[PDB]
Amino acid sequence: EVPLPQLRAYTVDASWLQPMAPLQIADHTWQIGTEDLTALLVQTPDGAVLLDGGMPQMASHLLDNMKARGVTPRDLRLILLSHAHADHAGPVAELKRRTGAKVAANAESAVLLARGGSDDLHFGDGITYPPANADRIVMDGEVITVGGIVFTAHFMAGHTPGSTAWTWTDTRNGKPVRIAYADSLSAPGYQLQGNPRYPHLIEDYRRSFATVRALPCDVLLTPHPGASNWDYAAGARAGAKALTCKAYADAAEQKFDGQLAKETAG
Amino acid sequence: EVPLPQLRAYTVDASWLQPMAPLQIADHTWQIGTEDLTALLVQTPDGAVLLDGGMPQMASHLLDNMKARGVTPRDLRLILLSHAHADHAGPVAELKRRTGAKVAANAESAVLLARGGSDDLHFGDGITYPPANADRIVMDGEVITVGGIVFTAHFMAGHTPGSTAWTWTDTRNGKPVRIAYADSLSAPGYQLQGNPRYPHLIEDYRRSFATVRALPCDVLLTPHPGASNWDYAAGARAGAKALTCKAYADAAEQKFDGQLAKETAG
Amino acid sequence: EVPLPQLRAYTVDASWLQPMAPLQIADHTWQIGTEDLTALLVQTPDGAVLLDGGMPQMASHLLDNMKARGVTPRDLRLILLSHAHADHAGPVAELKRRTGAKVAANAESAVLLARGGSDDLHFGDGITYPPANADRIVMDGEVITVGGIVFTAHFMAGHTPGSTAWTWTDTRNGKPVRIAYADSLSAPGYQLQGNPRYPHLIEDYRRSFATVRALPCDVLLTPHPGASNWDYAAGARAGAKALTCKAYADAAEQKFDGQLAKETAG
Amino acid sequence: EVPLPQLRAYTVDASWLQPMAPLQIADHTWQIGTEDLTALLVQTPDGAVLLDGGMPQMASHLLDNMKARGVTPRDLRLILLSHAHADHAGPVAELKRRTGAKVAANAESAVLLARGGSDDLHFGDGITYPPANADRIVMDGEVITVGGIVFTAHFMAGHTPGSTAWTWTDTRNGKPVRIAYADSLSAPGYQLQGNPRYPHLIEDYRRSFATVRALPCDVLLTPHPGASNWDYAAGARAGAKALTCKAYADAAEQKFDGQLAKETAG
Ligand SMILES: O=C(O)[C@H]1CS[C@@H]2CS[C@@H](CS)N12
Ligand SMILES: O=C(O)[C@H]1CS[C@@H]2CS[C@@H](CS)N12
Ligand SMILES: O=C(O)[C@H]1CS[C@@H]2CS[C@@H](CS)N12
Ligand SMILES: O=C(O)[C@H]1CS[C@@H]2CS[C@@H](CS)N12
Ligand SMILES: [Zn+2]
Ligand SMILES: [Zn+2]
Ligand SMILES: [Zn+2]
Ligand SMILES: [Zn+2]
Ligand SMILES: [Zn+2]
Ligand SMILES: [Zn+2]
Ligand SMILES: [Zn+2]
Ligand SMILES: [Zn+2]
């Protein structure tokens, strides 16, 4: 007879796990994650900020890249998140143990983070990671300032209820660069209509397309770089093909409309 | 070049995942887990108690067996744990969502349960499961009474800091049966001496052998049935070869002493 | 010289603390709180629901009234909240310890409840109460069904970020009665404009007036009965003067507009 | 008729709330609390440690004294606790919000801290304070090192289940000074014998007298300075009359034995 199935690990494309050296985006902002998962380090005269960490097994690589940038574990002050799925918040618990970093997130992201991504609205317990506690709860439009760099939260619920875009202004060539780190606008395998766990899912996505379209946005970055047409392995041309926030939102909405139509037809 | 390794799932022997029908231990007490993982259902005129749940994927099987016993989800009042590792507390979060059950545990087990077994003193993040919150914190020697059956906590730290034996008195053939559900006394791959995460590990194990030896114990049961020589697949003879609590403690101590000697020699 | 001030207790009008016997609202719905704080008991063939509990010292009185209604501690299945301030969620922790009740709330209310109302956006640590954990997180528009009575969540952020209206359909004289338990729409001493802890406060209140105006609403009830012109001490005429949801929302908006004007002038 | 009683604030002797300037204990160790509540600042070349904070309203005074010592909010790295009652852990939540500090505590202290001192084994909800989360859980005998100063945990359960002595070695006049910060050994109004919430209370106190007696202890400090005969207002003679750890333990045991006898006679 037949035993219950073994637990299945959350496995991902190899490029999501391929370490890369730090790639500079602007004067204080660096990509320090893997080829296909974004983890942004922002360095200030008063400590560093990390936006996303990628997968759980990326913690040591992140710490190595911070060190290469001159950031010791004590210097990391703040972790911000796009959303609290395993492939973006994965190493947060371990980073908190090994650095001085505290986590700021909205309430939805905080409760999902605290249960390690378990009981996901769409994925059940299939994508769990080590749970972590948020140290600060942020509201929509709230700002957090570190070493004089101001980060603004823009809620864009849909991909998760707590999905957030973070914006800040850096510099390049003596000119301001308004960076928008916009969260995922995908709905991979989601039941969109009449979802009892997320009854206003479609309304939230539509509002979120509008939110992303209107962001202050000289340079768009996304948790999965391919979503904004970044190629982190392409060196000096890594961001050459990057979408505007308007184009990113429009593409996501067109895809979403197609998915809605297929769902009705399914 | 080389990507970071994929996450590895916690996989176990097939017999640990082999469903079995309920096996009666005494008038109110049943084994309802798998062939090689204990999950005890105690049925009272005022609701049911579950002691351990086994692996995370066992939740639905547990609920099926409760139903077979006449226990609806609303009837399950209380979950108790031997210790909060993935193969004994695995389905606790899901059971809480799907039943009326509340969890009672000591502080050490509660904090480990709340982080889903992550940052384990010995296993790091290798054995995580969905986190759950305890509803009641118990102290050593504290009693919990359900439908007139009295459960007593006996702390036996070592295998985990929060390892607990639970004892209660059931009946069989009109005579009282003092049941001892004693936790694991193993230290699988543990650094025993000079462990910076558990400096008093050896003292705690020695105290725990003494605690187990002295338990009220007409019938011994253990989270892994093989540890007390139970054979759940052997029907009417399932408990025939079961160890006494004294014999279980003595065997565990002799094994532990051997492991200490090998560690010194390693 | 001068010692730091003593801690100050959260004290309230005596009528907020004046016990009353259960007052029937509809066939399954009763007011069981105090003269001036609402606590609604909904009794079903499969257990009871409590909506709000009032102040922390009201726990035993609530349990007394449940008993008078035939509801034992084991029979209380679910606690819902308007918002997680001390005068409405006060006894929740104790009720959870003393009954079978589990708490369902949105993420904002859950995180405020979990810190016992401390670090309030407007009141700091002035109104703390015993913290409690939510057992279930609900989304806007989500339904919860108990004994066949269906409760629908309607988020109406403003008074707190997690402020919620709950609606359900009961019966009276063989006819359906659509009950709306709408949260507070007050902003007592709040900084409304340019509040760094709540930057979209005004937008949220405006949306919430519209939400309340549109609720299914044969009978309106509010956490403070005076807000909807209920008089719990007036017996058979207790609800005679009750506002419609439309009138409640309109009055709240007119008051809010006046407060905005005074703030600008202050 | 009669309303339920108003909530009662936890009020204390004025001297417990009387601010004092920093008082040096050894080369890196300062008393920065109030005249009658200990809060120890330990300053290292790599950040500062705070042991206890006193009452909730003491947060700003603590931050003022740290500033006077040259410790900015970012420089405070670690908070340790004797035990998690309101008059020693009171300001911890606020300190975490306003500084870079993370909390390390044992599991018992962590769960009590997380519920803001509510549901106390002896005092119920009479002494609540803002809840805080621990960032690191420590085991008995575990060390924590900051800027080269090594702090060792010594569990001494009784006054609370999580009561802890902290020891470290500082210097004075070129010679090592072994400082013991030993927790309270009082049992104020406690039911000692047959306490269903703390069945092994007497055994734990007896073990704790023995633990305190044996501590490395050139200088004893206690959360209430009077308990070790410190007089913080007495300047150069503040510690002149301080008890040894042996004398402190002996006095506490003699008092405890008297209380046991009175309880039997009561
Ligand atoms: O990649 C995907 O299709 C889905 C399957 S499980 C995981 C959660 S949402 C997305 C990662 S952002 N991902
Ligand atoms: O079975 C074992 O050797 C170890 C490896 S990881 C997991 C945690 S302790 C034991 C299950 S009780 N087990
Ligand atoms: O009644 C009030 O004015 C304020 C002062 S503090 C407390 C929190 S909001 C309202 C109770 S709903 N209340
Ligand atoms: O001071 C006291 O008698 C008691 C009454 S309530 C509070 C908790 S234990 C002690 C403060 S350490 N104290
Ligand atoms: Zn995702
Ligand atoms: Zn992703
Ligand atoms: Zn184990
Ligand atoms: Zn096991
Ligand atoms: Zn309120
Ligand atoms: Zn109120
Ligand atoms: Zn105390
Ligand atoms: Zn004290």
Coordinates of C-alpha atoms in Angstrom, one line a residue, chain A residues 1-12 14 17-19 55-58 97 114-116 118-119 125 130-131, chain B residues 1-12 14 17-19 55-58 97 114-116 118-119 125 130-131:
Chain A
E1 CA 0.0 0.0 0.0
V2 CA 0.8 3.7 -0.2
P3 CA 2.5 6.1 2.2
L4 CA 1.6 9.8 2.3
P5 CA 3.9 11.8 -0.1
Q6 CA 7.2 13.2 1.1
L7 CA 7.4 16.9 1.6
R8 CA 8.4 18.7 -1.6
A9 CA 11.0 21.5 -1.5
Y10 CA 10.4 24.8 -3.2
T11 CA 12.8 24.5 -6.1
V12 CA 13.5 27.3 -8.6
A14 CA 19.2 27.8 -11.4
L17 CA 20.3 31.0 -7.4
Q18 CA 23.3 32.1 -9.4
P19 CA 25.4 34.5 -7.3
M55 CA 15.7 32.9 -1.5
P56 CA 16.4 31.5 2.0
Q57 CA 19.8 30.1 1.0
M58 CA 21.0 33.5 -0.2
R97 CA 20.0 37.0 13.6
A114 CA 5.5 36.0 10.8
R115 CA 4.0 32.7 9.6
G116 CA 6.9 32.1 7.3
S118 CA 2.5 29.4 5.4
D119 CA -1.2 29.3 4.7
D125 CA 1.9 25.5 2.6
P130 CA 11.8 30.7 8.2
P131 CA 9.4 33.0 9.9
Chain B
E1 CA 29.7 28.4 -12.9
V2 CA 27.7 27.3 -9.9
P3 CA 24.2 28.3 -8.5
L4 CA 23.4 28.1 -4.8
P5 CA 21.9 24.7 -3.9
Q6 CA 18.1 24.2 -4.2
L7 CA 16.2 24.0 -0.9
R8 CA 16.1 20.4 0.3
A9 CA 12.8 19.0 1.7
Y10 CA 12.7 17.1 4.9
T11 CA 12.2 13.6 3.7
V12 CA 11.5 10.6 6.0
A14 CA 8.1 5.6 4.0
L17 CA 4.1 8.3 6.3
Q18 CA 2.1 5.1 6.1
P19 CA -1.5 5.7 7.2
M55 CA 4.5 15.1 9.9
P56 CA 2.9 18.2 8.2
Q57 CA 1.2 16.2 5.5
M58 CA -0.7 14.0 8.0
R97 CA -7.2 26.2 11.2
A114 CA 6.0 29.8 16.8
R115 CA 9.1 29.9 14.5
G116 CA 8.0 26.7 12.7
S118 CA 13.5 27.2 12.3
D119 CA 16.8 28.2 13.9
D125 CA 16.7 25.6 9.2
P130 CA 4.2 25.8 9.3
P131 CA 4.5 27.9 12.5

